Design a protein around this ligand. Structure first.
Ligand SMILES: COc1cc(O)cc(/C=C/c2ccc(O)cc2)c1
Length: 275
């Protein structure tokens, strides 16, 4: 699938940088014809068949295809896609309140503040999983606020760079996500499905309530070993005033066997969440 090959600079002006990663950088931008503001994600293309630098076109096309399907208040929307010899440039909805991760460093949240964020995450993931889309990269870095100066900020899931359609119940590919947030099946290179996202939600919930990462070791290999062994516990120093029902929600997500883990529908009916 080919994308728009006119120079993006003829149609947009760029501004402040919003984030940069391994092979991509995101810049605030403004469409000249409308004055509307977006986030331009420049993804570096691979320049040879067998290179390790840049992103393969198959991977770029999958991210674009997923983004084109989604329209939900808690997920980023795609506006346009351009390309040139060096980059694919996705013009994405602008979410400018910063990461949940940076918001988290400023506060530990109350259970109400946690559940207000968490319910929005669950609603976005419910939409995705209903479409058989696994995100495969859920973590505070990929949750951005619309306005960080309201008591209950609205959030959007970003970065569909690892997302896959799961039309056969599972996909057998390597997912090099962030060790602190990946499920045991990712660590063990097993077939992957929607369940991996539910584990990540359990990790996110633990962090929201405590400010601490449940599996984090001193090295990436320690973290991955802890994940595979389900080596976590609720430290009383951090959880002493957290309700047992909140701990129960987490416990039913941080389950090694994907088949025994709560699904997204289970998580919405769980007594901690269900109104
Ligand atoms: C590319 O690498 C990164 C790393 C990172 O920590 C954050 C971002 C921000 C993405 C983004 C997308 C759409 C928006 O509207 C606003 C931000 C990008």
């Amino acid at each position: 699938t080919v994308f728009r090959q006119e120079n993006v600079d003829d149609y947009y002006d760029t501004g402040e940088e919003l984030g940069s990663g391994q092979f991509a950088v995101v810049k605030k931008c403004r469409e000249k014809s409308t004055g509307l503001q977006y986030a331009a994600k420049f993804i570096k293309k691979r320049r040879t068949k067998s290179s390790r630098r840049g992103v393969s076109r198959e991977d770029i096309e999958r991210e674009v295809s997923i983004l084109k399907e989604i329209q939900h208040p808690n997920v980023i929307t795609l506006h346009e896609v351009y390309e040139n010899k060096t980059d694919v440039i996705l013009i994405l909805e602008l979410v400018a309140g910063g990461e949940l991760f940076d918001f988290l460093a400023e506060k530990s949240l109350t259970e109400e503040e946690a559940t207000e964020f968490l319910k929005q995450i669950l609603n976005g993931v419910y939409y995705l999983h209903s479409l058989q889309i696994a995100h495969f990269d859920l973590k505070p870095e990929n949750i951005m606020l619309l306005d960080r100066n309201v008591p209950k900020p609205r959030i959007k899931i970003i970065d569909f760079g690892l997302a896959h359609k799961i039309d056969f119940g599972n996909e057998f590919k390597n997912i090099f996500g962030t060790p602190e947030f990946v499920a045991p099946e990712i660590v063990n290179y097993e077939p992957l499905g929607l369940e991996a996202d539910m584990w990540s939600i359990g990790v996110i919930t633990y962090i929201l309530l405590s400010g601490a990462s449940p599996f984090l070791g001193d090295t990436k290999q320690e973290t991955l070993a802890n994940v595979s062994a389900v080596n976590y516990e609720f430290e009383d120093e951090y959880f002493s005033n957290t309700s047992a029902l909140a701990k129960d929600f987490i416990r039913r997500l941080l389950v090694k066997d994907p088949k025994k883990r709560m699904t997204i529908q289970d998580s919405l009916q769980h007594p901690w969440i269900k109104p």
